[PDB]
């Protein structure tokens, strides 16, 4: 009667109303936008590196560890100054897909905290992982502006 849905992180059935699924749909959106950025032919190496970092961090909820080079990259990166409008008016597609991906990462962060206040995820979601998702978003930002 109460709709349930498979969660791969707990290997269980959760209520379909769960915030998990909202979190996941933001991660997937982020990766889908990085895919659209990959599809543009601009900056292919740096867009695939950041996709790799996000998927590794994302899969750390159930497994998946960054190497040393890619943690340096996140801990080196602060969040820079920007004006979204200027990137929008020109309409460079690669850079707009990057921004959409950052928007999605930022939403995933928001939901990842809401997730962390549920019984099923209080012990699985660690602020370390959240801090890496956040820094990955800061990388996207710096790359889109470059």
Q: How far is CA 43 from CA 51, 73, 94, in A?
A: 12, 17, 8
DSSP secondary structure of 14-63: EETT-HHHHHHHHHHHHHHHHHHHHHT-SSHHHHHHHHHHHHHHHHTTT-
Q: Where are the domains of the chain?
A: 1-146
Q: Rounded to an integer, what distance in angstroms lies between the CA atom of residue 146 and that of residue 137?
A: 14
Q: How far apart are CA 26 and CA 85, in angstroms?
A: 23
Within 10 angstroms of residue 118's Cβ, the number of other Cβ atoms is 14
CA–CA gap between residue 64 and residue 50 (Å, rounded): 15
CA 14 to each of CA 2, 10, 130: distance values in angstroms, whole numbers, following the listed order: 10, 9, 22
> Residue 39: CA atoms inside 13 Å, Cβ hemisphere, count?
10
- Which CATH number describes the domain made up of 1-146? 1.20.1200.10
Q: What are phi and psi of 83, to 5 degrees?
A: -130, 105
């Amino acid at each position: 009667m109460d709709i349930k849905r498979y969660c791969p992180v707990t290997d269980s059935e959760l209520p379909a109303d769960h915030v998990y699924f909202k979190f996941r749909s933001e991660i997937e959106a982020a990766e889908a936008y990085l895919g659209l950025a990959i599809s543009e032919g601009i900056k292919v190496r740096e867009t695939r590196e950041i996709l790799d970092i996000i998927d590794t961090v994302y899969n750390s909820l159930s497994d998946s560890k960054l190497n040393d080079f890619q943690e340096k990259r996140l801990n080196f990166t602060e969040e820079d100054w920007y004006d979204i409008k200027e990137k929008a008016n020109n309409g460079n597609r690669w850079s707009l897909y990057m921004f959409l991906a950052r928007s999605a990462v930022d939403s995933a962060v928001y939901w990842s905290y809401r997730m962390k206040e549920t019984e099923e995820f209080k012990e699985i979601v660690k602020e370390e992982m959240i801090s890496k998702l956040l820094k990955a978003g800061y990388v996207i930002l710096r790359e889109s502006l470059g």
